[PDB]
Amino acid sequence: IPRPPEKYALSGHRSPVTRVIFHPVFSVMVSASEDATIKVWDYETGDFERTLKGHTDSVQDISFDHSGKLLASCSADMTIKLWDFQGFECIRTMHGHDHNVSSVAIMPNGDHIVSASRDKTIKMWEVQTGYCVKTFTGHREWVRMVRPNQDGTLIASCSNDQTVRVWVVATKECKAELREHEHVVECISWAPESSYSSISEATGSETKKSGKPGPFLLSGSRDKTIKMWDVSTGMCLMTLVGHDNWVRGVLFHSGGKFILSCADDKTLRVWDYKNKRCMKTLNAHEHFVTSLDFHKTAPYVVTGSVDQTVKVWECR
Amino acid sequence: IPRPPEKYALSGHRSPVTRVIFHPVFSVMVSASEDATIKVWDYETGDFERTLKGHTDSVQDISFDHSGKLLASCSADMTIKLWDFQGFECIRTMHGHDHNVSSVAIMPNGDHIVSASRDKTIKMWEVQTGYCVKTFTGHREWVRMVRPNQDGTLIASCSNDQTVRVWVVATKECKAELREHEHVVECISWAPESSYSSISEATGSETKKSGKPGPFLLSGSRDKTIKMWDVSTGMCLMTLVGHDNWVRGVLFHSGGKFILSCADDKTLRVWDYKNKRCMKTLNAHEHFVTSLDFHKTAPYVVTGSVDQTVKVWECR
Amino acid sequence: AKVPQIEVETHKVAAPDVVVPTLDTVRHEALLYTWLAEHKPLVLCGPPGSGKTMTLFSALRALPDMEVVGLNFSSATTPELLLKTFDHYCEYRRTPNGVVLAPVQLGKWLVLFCDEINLPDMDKYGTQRVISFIRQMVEHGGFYRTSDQTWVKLERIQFVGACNPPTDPGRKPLSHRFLRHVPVVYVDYPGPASLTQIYGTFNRAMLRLIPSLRTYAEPLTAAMVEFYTMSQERFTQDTQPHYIYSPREMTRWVRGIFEALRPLETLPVEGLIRIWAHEALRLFQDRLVEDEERRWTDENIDTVALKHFPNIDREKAMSRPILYSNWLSKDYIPVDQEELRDYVKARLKVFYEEELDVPLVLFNEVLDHVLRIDRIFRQPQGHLLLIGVSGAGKTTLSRFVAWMNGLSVYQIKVHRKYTGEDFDEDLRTVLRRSGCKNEKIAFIMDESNVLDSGFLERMNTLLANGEVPGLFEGDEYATLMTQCKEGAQKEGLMLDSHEELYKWFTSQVIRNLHVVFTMNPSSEGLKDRAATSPALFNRCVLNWFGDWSTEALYQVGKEFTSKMDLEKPNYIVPDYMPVVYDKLPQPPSHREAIVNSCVFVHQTLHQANARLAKRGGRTMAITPRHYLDFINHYANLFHEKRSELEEQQMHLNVGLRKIKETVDQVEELRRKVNRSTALLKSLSAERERWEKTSETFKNQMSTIAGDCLLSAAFIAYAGYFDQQMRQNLFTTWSHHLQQANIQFRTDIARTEYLSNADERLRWQASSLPADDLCTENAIMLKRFNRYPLIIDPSGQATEFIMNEYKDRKITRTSFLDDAFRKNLESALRFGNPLLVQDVESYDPVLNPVLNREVRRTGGRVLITLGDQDIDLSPSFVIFLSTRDPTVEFPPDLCSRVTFVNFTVTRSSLQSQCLNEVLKAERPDVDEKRSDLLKLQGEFQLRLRQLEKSLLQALNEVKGRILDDDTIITTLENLKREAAEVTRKVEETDIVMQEVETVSQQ
């Protein structure tokens, strides 16, 4: 759990930060901004490492593969670039979206990319060539974010139509349409397997014949609430309230015991779902907080912001 | 420390480049030249950003603030222009201050600026309004360079009368009048605290009752000598010789361990003052070198020159 | 006796289905029960909000076999409404031994609640069609269907009407032959004690949430009643038609206070008083039109609060910006003005990227209005009616707040062909989206988007009922039934019957469809609009935006001119200053005088319009968009003029420095020489004026503020007026600026300052009359923000524009032409200029492109025409024109385009007459005149060329006179200009005087 003393306040961007993530292996952190610069910092020492230009307009999302050797980024110029992170070079570029791309993610299999755009559809690309292979359609408005599950056999996409659709990769069929939010869904996040059983304890959800509790999912919206759904049944297991503005990012603690989230209320909130024990609040930034990320192993948290400053907090 | 290979040699100016500075936070290199234009460069990738042609005549000196949002520039048109770096436009142009204004500076308070010219005086202006309130007199000739201390309570001025004065901002008295150079003093620079203790064993300076080694200053002149001066005592701590022509700029390495100088000898020289171990000299330019700057965090240095080429070098 | 002092639950206070039993209520309910059990049609006549509908439902719910169907009567209703109502609910048209009409639900009667029955207009000779129909189908117990001309007899059908006193404006009495069969009951406004007890029960139910303000239940109520009574005896309907205050206002007052107290846990008396005052301001301070009434309302709200709570902290409860929001926090709570401003600025920055990249200034008024509209959108059935001048931001603010609330804004695309069927299809679309496939919708209507009265009556029934009957007929009914069934299964409700699904759909539409009607504050149109559709004045909360106050105009002026270098330290404050801004600091700086003069100019346009209206013809309305264009022009002109003057001074200074270096050269050679001295003298002949100009550079920079202000005000406002009015406006502006000691270079014509001679030559060669007014109109055509509209009796401006943009492949098109769309689309995708004629038949599909409703797509700007979305090219420019000086344009187009009036002047007509008479009478002299005028223009062009090239070459050289090229260039230039002066002087002496003498006769 991160606490109020931030470790470093890394500021270099000339435009608001959009997404911040951790390299899965190396002790290096990456932040994307609206100035088309993927600046790469070092969170351990609080030192700038090197920027990554190449996009024409604002970068909306960035993601690493399982091995961390590749970094896929999507920008507002309808382009998805791929980066050889060992060489810091753009080895490929992909076009095809009618309007700006606002999400990107690599399949855990490492052989495909998925992206979501304002053209009300989700595209899937192949790593070897860059050619679109599948096109998920069915959203009626801007799709904000797409994030696959752990094994890569399903994806989940939230959109401005105030719905969250869970899709099957194998046959493009819409497995679920979770619609209970009262506003635009801003962000989603899957539930790590380590938390599965704990989930069943918090909501009291009953197990099925196969013994698998059913994959769970989180959805933050501009209705200032974070809902949690069970994909296997398509029902809202619980709702979490307390944010004073639009939720921008939401994620699970690696230990499956807390839910971290950041909103436009300038606060990072750590919530408890099993016992509703902790509701910790952090005055993270002086302006809107756009995204957050929690390191898988090291006890650090990073949060972007509109004040054009990234912050690193230590977990204690 | 800067080494042989120049990383970039950006050549866009139509007139000899006067002074080059770094932006405090953003990766931006700003240059001023005699063509009444202020050019903006990206020293990370050697790219051009924007040219500001608002000034009438040749631009002498430019200066940012601590936050990097405002930029005060001076030119031979007897005006001081306040450039809002945010909007890249003039928000104030304070008039008066007769004759060619030689230098302008923003004190660390960020609410007032100082300006020095041919009119044998130094005027202080408010950023908020631009009305002259204090006007230091006593210099007998052209005043070239002015730079306040790091807390804003003192200023220093070098002049063509071959005297360097240390003035107190609060009550308009001449705290020190160090007049020991053999020729006109062109550049002056204060010392960071991170090197004060170093000075203690560098020159053998003794401590007073307060324990502080005392505020330190530097002055390079046309006499090919660089003097380091103790503001508290007004004594010549140490003089450094070896430049083949007039010294144009002198400053401290961010680590407080080397001294950098650029002179009319078309070379930049890195000297050691504590132990005199290092006396490195590099052929900076084919012609005169007008100014030099060291990035506070990045291992990058920038040199402006009369040949209208701005050269950036890396430190290793 | 039979009036129990019931205690309402702490929840559902002031709910639609609750009423405190009072003497009047139990008496009238008993009477209505007596009359309804006898199945006798009846009528309730009382002022709006008295409690007629609630008493009717209370009487009806006692009868368990009695089901009601609502019906709303406008002033444009026909028996077809009743026929549709019977077809929809009374399907059985069976004819056993006679045609009888009965509902499906057997054993149950039907009450057709007809509201505002006396609105239906009486045609000539004084007859109301629907009233006559009711008299027929009541007295004779049936009617004649038009299908077979057969008599249909009513079964299990009865009628109750709700109306108003005849003396109420907009009301008309019923015929005595009709009043025979319907008894009338008069329901008056609840009396002071009655209101006290009725709402006292509500307040005691509400304050039970916080078990510390219980003791404040009995004061609060009284205070409300006190204040309410004042609003009835001060803001009568005799002043404006919408000043009707009923117990309904006190009901929504208690509901608002209760909702503001629901999630909150603990609250002192100060917070309760603050919430009460905020609600009273949201219920009694918005519908007001003028500021005097607003000041009176604020004074008395604070006065009554202090009177009823002597031991209160006035400052904590009564602050001036009484604001509340649920954006900053998750609970409806007070918010400080500055934090709200910063938050709305950031959210608006996000909104720009979302939609409408058009920037907005955020002054105090905007914040208030966006808070009000958010309040209304948060309600379940929230219908809003914004009355303000066009362009004030009503539509854009509504779209902004709707985006904030997640509503999918849907506006009708009105066009020339738009008819009743098109609007019915639009209603079907919006209702299908809202009811089935549930999604909130901000249906935005404009007072011009309504063409037929059918649109008004459809909107009336949709607003009041929450669902329009008969819109989905035949196949549409079945398809909607299927869609509602699927939506119910998705939601979880299992419904099969038709009426169950219809009621579910109606509830969904009521919950998730908010209508925003934007209308212009037209006098005598308020009463007419109330008569033609009472729902707007009954089921819609009325927000009077009005026109931007001087305070608001001052804020937007400062905010946009926050970049201009208006600071003048030596600005001497005059002994007298004309104060226009109410809160102007009396020792103001230069900026606070410039913005003051800007708002003064905008206020001057209103006086000019009034003067033109009083003695003259049509006046075009002044809107805030005109002020925005004035400020944008002022800023752009300031940057351009400042840049040009600075660059000119830079070139002059560097040239003079090079001349000084040349003097150094020649003097050090003198201490190959004859040419040096000759060029020195010839160049000093110009150096004298160069030094004069360099000296006057400071003076020109000093007066660049007033001149740019006057020029922007001229090219942004006086684009419609004739020469006399333009000169009067400019003279008044100059007099005011001189009063404020604002520097501006007098004795300089506006046309010369705005436009140089270089483009004036092209214009004159492009078939443009050589006069002041035409030059100014061309200037306005050149520098424009909103696309122009040319109002020219003669066609001269048409070929002027055609020739000027001929090189760009400008295409000729008209609104009347059917291919107008295609050509338009072509331009929108190709960036070629378009000139559109016949603007009288304006096509509203142009509304987005005129407002630049572009959408950045990472580098491409995208515009939606009608329903199809097309990429826009940056080279696209569109012009509008007509040949009718006396014609009226639609109000929506009035504020969307700049106006340029190509009238004729006495000077221009004199010039044309002289030129023609010299062409006919003395052709030889006319030929001389023409060849000398053109020759003079060519000399001026060459003079500017050689003079500028001299400076350009002098700047370019970085050496000295030793260069071989410089000496020959300077000698040839001096020779050439001297020779040109020789021809100029000779032709202006010996040949121009003769031409003038010949033309003098």
Ligand SMILES: Nc1ncnc2c1ncn2[C@@H]1O[C@H](COP(=O)(O)OP(=O)(O)O)[C@@H](O)[C@H]1O
């Ligand atoms: N005694 C009362 N009890 C409850 N509400 C009342 C009472 N008297 C007036 N009202 C309120 O007055 C309003 C009357 O609305 P309605 O009956 O539709 O008006 P109209 O008289 O025009 O038919 C409602 O807000 C209602 O709650």
Ligand SMILES: Nc1ncnc2c1ncn2[C@@H]1O[C@H](COP(=O)(O)OP(=O)(O)O)[C@@H](O)[C@H]1O
């Ligand atoms: N407060 C404001 N600040 C800046 N521009 C505004 C403001 N209000 C309106 N506008 C401009 O007016 C236009 C929108 O007018 P609109 O709201 O459709 O008119 P109406 O007031 O008749 O509903 C756009 O050009 C918009 O930028």
